[PDB]
Design a protein around this nucleic acid. Structure first.
Lengths: 52, 131, 61, 149, 136, 386
RNA sequence: GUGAACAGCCUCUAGUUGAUAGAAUAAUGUAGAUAAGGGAAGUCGGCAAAAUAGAUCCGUAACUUCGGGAUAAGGAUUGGC
RNA sequence: AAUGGAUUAACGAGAUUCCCACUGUCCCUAUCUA
RNA sequence: GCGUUGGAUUGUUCACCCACUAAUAGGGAACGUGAGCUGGGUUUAGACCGUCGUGAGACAGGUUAGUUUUACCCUACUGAUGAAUGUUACCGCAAUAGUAAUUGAACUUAGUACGAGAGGAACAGUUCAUUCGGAUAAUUGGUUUUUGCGGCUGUCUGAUCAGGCAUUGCCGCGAAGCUACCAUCCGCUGGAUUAUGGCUGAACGCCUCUAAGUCAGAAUCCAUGCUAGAACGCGGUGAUUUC
């Protein structure tokens, strides 16, 4: 069996990172920063209740 | 866990149990099989002199005379009086399958009961006539 | 004289990890400090200015 | 997932708990916990053990035969999945279980009524047959009132 | 896995080491089996090759017909009596140790199997499951 | 001679020296690097580990022998209150390493993080940042310079956060400071972000979500001075051997005349720092969300808190993360949750999990019941009830 | 008192309450234990430990100098009222 | 071959081999007390 | 780099089988390793049989029985504090040192290439396991001085009640804790090369893989990653006493 650090498996794994498994990451990073930009919008409206 | 309970109640040294023994007495065909086993070399009384209540082979026909007149064998007679406690008794206690449970209790009261007592009456009729 | 002595936390005042609480040795030393303060009153010295300046201990037979 | 009961305990065995045993006659003996399992090896009898449920249904305790208890039997004929069955069963199971508890509490009051009769007949024997102790308490009240005075 | 066993074999508790007498579950004529080695086993200093449920071991026969004794032959274990883990939330164990005997292709020698057969053993070996009267 | 039976080494030489760590909060050695096109996003998070529970799951995994079947498995539950930001730090790349050149604080600190700076709080005059908030006068400008200096210089930017220990049942009153790096591009956008979050708290679902492979680091479970056999795994000498039997027999040969550095002596076991990677989040619940433990199947309004709470830890009532396997560390301890360090490649990093039942029976005994309404339903009424 | 017993364990008369003590409960020890599944694969070697154990009834082989072997082996049983 | 040899019941803190029972010797270590 | 076993006969290595396995490779370190073990065998005094001697006794020889017993010392190694760099506290960087994962099968390619037949592969995509390591206590087992709750024999406090003693009296269950491939979880990817395959290309008016230049290419090497953090390597920030 080939090892972890063989040159052939690291080339086959490098093709998969160019394809699907980065697009599942790049979709996750956009959904998360949506909720972080909504988190200020909640915590400014809590500040506006103090201003009334 | 303990010392004494491990010696007798391992998985290797398990006895038969109370569930199957009630089935063996309940009909007249399985009684005549166990009273008349074919003789076997790998069994203590050479496949004769077997008590049905206590799942246990005896060495000699003398060792049935002294076994039936004992407080050990009068457990297992008194133990097998009623309904043999299947899984169905434990499920009925939680509110689950009453009609499966109550119909079996209806059959042990009506049918399976007096067929068993007319078998245990004949064992004392037979084991006194031969011993 | 401090080999194989157990450590303790209370020696951080002096910077030493090895400290010990000798009971019998203190009872003679504060017996002698009680004697020296009695001797300085008899000469007519001051109480607040008085300090231990020389102290010495060496072996008996 | 199956909330199947203990063989000895009649308590529910959630997924991830207890030991199963399999007889060579091939029926399964599922167990609530280790207490019920070590007591099974030792050949006991749950008609005799007071803490189990098989004793309590048999010994004239908590009610055994009821119309509410016949609703949860088992079904060996599958019902083809209509949703409007499912929406009513989630309303049925919240309704059967309430009537279960209003009958089980009411069954407990039949078994414990008239304790206050025997509670008071016990007190007539302690008070009336101890006349000398009742003299001691009368001066105890008078010493109590005089200290406030 | 090896020859005959279709699929893969998960990790279960190792109940039977070398030199463990176990019962014989078919109608071939052997009464007890006697394990000498376990196939697919590891190699570590001072260990014993240990069998499990649904393994193939090389096993001799101590009690049986004189045609069958004094020859090593493969055998498949169908009952364990050491508690293992099904992946739905239950541990379970059988009453005794048991094994049927077979050729290295995995094909049964007898015609029937007495007693219950383990579920993980019946998935791994198809020819056992054809002769199994009772599963689990 | 030539050892006559080759065998693997007992113990791993990578995790040496086996010694007690520097702090209960384990430090983070390296972060996921920087993708300078992405939005601004935090890279790690810190919370408090509390207990275990079981999970059944309908395994949707192509190719396995447990495809479309059910699988029980054990997860951890880490109490995760919202975490509030108090500072920015910039680092200048030298030809020696990184070097911090500026920290900037945040006009008003909580009483938890005035408590970190003291070891004797109750005698102190609580004078932690009094001279600093007078430098937020009319325009500030001792701050805006130190913001503009980080904008000009300072290749990477780390952000100081701390927990909110007063919202935790853990009775400790004193929050932990930490540094978290950012990974949004164009570090002017990094440092404008963090100035807009001073005195402002960050949630947990703004850092993670379900189906993600993260990694937890902590300081793991001290045991004191432990002998060689349970420390390294050395075989026991047979019985009644002179000078003991729980030890290594031959510690060296006649050359070299020194005990070498690889022969498994006795000493400290436990309370080391560790890093365990590829742990998979199953469930991100909310504190205000009642019925957290109820899945899509159960529909029984129950929280993940088991009956009588966890063992040596109270109730949950905050956000939490349910991540499978076992995090290094013990209960009521601080763990730090980094995220994945690299794009994972296996199909196990991509599966959409679907919880089916969460256990909530009591951990303080052989617990049988889920909710305290079950126990009253099953037992019937009792003597103290009527 | 239990028991076949001056065995062992417990108490009355009589006698001591002496043997450096306090605080903590790491390793390795010394002394004593219990372990799932398998059952000598350990080892020069079943060393050590475990198992058997009192009593009553039944039963008891080769061998032999007829006295023995013999408690041979192997089984059934044992509380309280 | 009374430098004594062959035989053999009973007896032995004598020397050696195996079989059932049995068990942390062992697979493989864990734990509790003084 | 990593891995090389489990058993069977003599004190025995010598010498040789049985099965598994991917494989059962060879060596060294006072023929590694007795102030680690072992005394099995090596070497006293006891005793027998055999040979030789008139004899005491020795042996061509065989069998059996049998006393060397520190460590608290300095160093080494595994762990633990620690004076002094204005005091004190918090957040960091990384010199150097170590470094770890491994092998087998399975699905699909495919009964396809290849083949007269019998037979029968690869790489890509994917799922599990063998040794090894790091942790972890949900669950399941193991452990009980929680002497927690019961129970039993003997004696003792007049009986009941509640208890004492039996080197922890014994038996059953036993939470918490500690634990086990006897339980579950997790164990990465960049660069430079060796053999060797090549391109341009001379020496040598052809030709060549090499001399200048250059493209690849090994479980190899150094890094990313993971442990410790120089107690004399360093940075950033908080407060800084009036008796």
């Amino acid at each position: 069996a080939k090892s972890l650090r063989a040159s052939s498996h690291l080339n086959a794994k490098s093709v998969k990172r160019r394809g699907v498994f980065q697009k599942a990451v790049d979709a996750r990073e956009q959904r998360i920063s949506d909720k972080l930009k909504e988190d200020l919008l909640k915590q400014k409206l809590e500040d506006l209740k103090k201003k009334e | 866990m303990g010392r004494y309970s491990v010696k007798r109640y391992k998985t290797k040294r398990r006895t038969r149990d109370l569930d199957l023994i009630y089935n063996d007495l309940s009909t007249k065909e399985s009684v005549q099989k166990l009273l008349n086993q074919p003789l076997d070399e790998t069994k203590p009384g050479l496949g004769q002199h077997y008590c049905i209540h206590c799942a246990k082979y005896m060495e000699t026909a003398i060792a049935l005379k002294t076994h039936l007149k004992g407080k050990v064998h009068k457990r297992r007679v008194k133990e097998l009086r009623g309904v043999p406690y299947t899984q169905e008794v434990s499920d009925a206690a939680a509110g689950y399958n009453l009609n499966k449970f109550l119909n079996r209790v209806q059959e042990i009261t009506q049918s399976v009961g007096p067929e068993k007592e007319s078998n245990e009456a004949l064992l004392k009729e037979h084991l006194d006539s031969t011993l | 004289f401090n080999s194989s002595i157990g450590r303790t936390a209370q020696g951080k005042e002096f910077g030493v990890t090895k400290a010990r609480w000798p009971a019998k040795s203190v009872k003679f030393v504060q017996g002698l400090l009680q004697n020296a303060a009695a001797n300085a009153e008899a000469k007519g010295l001051d109480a607040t200015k008085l300090y231990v300046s020389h102290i010495q201990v060496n072996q008996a037979p | 997932m199956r909330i199947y009961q203990c063989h000895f305990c009649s308590s529910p065995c959630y997924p991830g708990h207890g030991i199963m045993f399999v007889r060579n006659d091939a029926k399964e003996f599922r167990f609530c916990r280790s207490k019920c399992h070590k007591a099974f090896k030792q050949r006991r009898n749950p008609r005799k053990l007071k803490w189990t449920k098989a004793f309590r249904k048999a010994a004239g305790k908590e009610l055994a035969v009821d119309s509410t208890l016949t609703f949860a039997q088992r079904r060996n004929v599958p019902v083809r999945y209509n949703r409007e069955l499912v929406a009513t069963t989630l309303k049925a199971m919240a309704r059967i279980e309430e009537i279960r508890q209003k009958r089980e509490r009411a069954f407990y009051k039949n078994r414990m009524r008239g304790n206050k009769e025997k509670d008071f007949l016990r007190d007539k024997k302690l008070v009336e047959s101890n006349p000398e102790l009742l003299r001691i308490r009368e001066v105890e009240i008078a010493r109590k009132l005089a200290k406030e005075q | 896995s090896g020859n005959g066993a279709q699929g893969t074999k998960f990790r279960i508790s190792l109940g039977l080491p070398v030199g463990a007498i176990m019962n014989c579950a078919d109608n071939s004529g052997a009464r007890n089996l006697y394990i000498i080695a376990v196939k697919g086993s590891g190699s570590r200093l001072n260990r014993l090759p240990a069998a499990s449920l649904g393994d193939m071991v090389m096993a001799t026969v101590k009690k049986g017909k004189p045609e069958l004794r004094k020859k090593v032959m493969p055998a498949i274990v169908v009952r364990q009596a050491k508690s293992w883990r099904r992946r739905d939330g239950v541990f379970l164990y059988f009453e005794d140790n048991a094994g049927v005997i077979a050729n290295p292709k995995g094909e049964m020698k007898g015609s029937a199997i007495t007693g219950p057969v383990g579920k993980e053993c019946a998935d791994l070996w198809p020819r056992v499951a054809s002769n199994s009267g009772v599963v689990v | 001679s030539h050892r006559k039976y080759e065998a693997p080494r007992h113990g791993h030489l990578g995790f040496l020296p086996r010694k007690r760590a520097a702090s209960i909060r384990a430090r983070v050695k390296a972060f996921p690097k920087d993708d300078r096109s992405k939005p601004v996003a935090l890279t790690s998070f810190l919370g408090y580990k509390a207990g275990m529970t079981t999970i059944v799951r309908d395994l949707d995994r192509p190719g396995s022998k447990f495809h479309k079947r059910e699988v029980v498995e054990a997860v951890t539950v880490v109490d995760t209150p919202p975490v509030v930001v108090v500072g920015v730090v910039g680092y200048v790349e030298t030809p020696r390493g990184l070097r911090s050149l500026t920290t900037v604080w945040a006009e008003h600190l909580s009483d938890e993080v005035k408590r970190r700076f003291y070891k004797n709080w109750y005698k102190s005059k609580k004078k932690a940042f009094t001279k600093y908030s007078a430098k937020y006068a009319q325009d500030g400008a001792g701050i805006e310079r130190e913001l503009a200096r980080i904008k000009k210089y300072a290749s990477v930017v780390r952000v100081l956060v701390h927990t909110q220990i007063r919202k935790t049942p853990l009775a400790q009153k004193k929050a932990h400071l930490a540094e978290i790096q950012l990974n949004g591009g164009s570090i002017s956008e990094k440092v404008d972000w963090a100035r807009e979050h001073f005195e402002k708290t960050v949630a947990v679902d703004s850092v993670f979500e379900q189906n993600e492979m993260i990694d937890a680091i902590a300081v793991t479970k001290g045991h004191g001075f432990e002998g060689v056999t349970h420390r390294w795994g050395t075989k026991k000498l047979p019985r009644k051997t002179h000078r003991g039997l729980r030890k290594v027999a031959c510690i060296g040969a006649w050359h070299p005349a020194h005990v070498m550095w690889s022969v498994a002596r006795a000493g400290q076991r436990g309370y080391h720092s560790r890093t365990s990677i590829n742990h998979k989040i199953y469930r991100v619940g909310k504190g205000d969300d009642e019925a957290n433990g109820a899945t899509s199947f159960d529909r029984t309004k129950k929280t993940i808190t088991p009956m009588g709470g966890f063992v040596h830890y109270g109730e949950i009532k905050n956000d939490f993360i349910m991540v499978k396997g076992c995090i290094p560390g013990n209960r009521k301890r601080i763990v730090t949750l980094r995220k994945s360090l690299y794009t994972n490649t296996s199909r196990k990093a991509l599966e959409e999990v679907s919880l089916k039942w969460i256990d909530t029976a009591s951990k303080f005994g052989k617990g049988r019941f889920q909710t305290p309404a079950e126990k009253h339903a099953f037992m019937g009424t009792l003597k103290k009830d009527l």
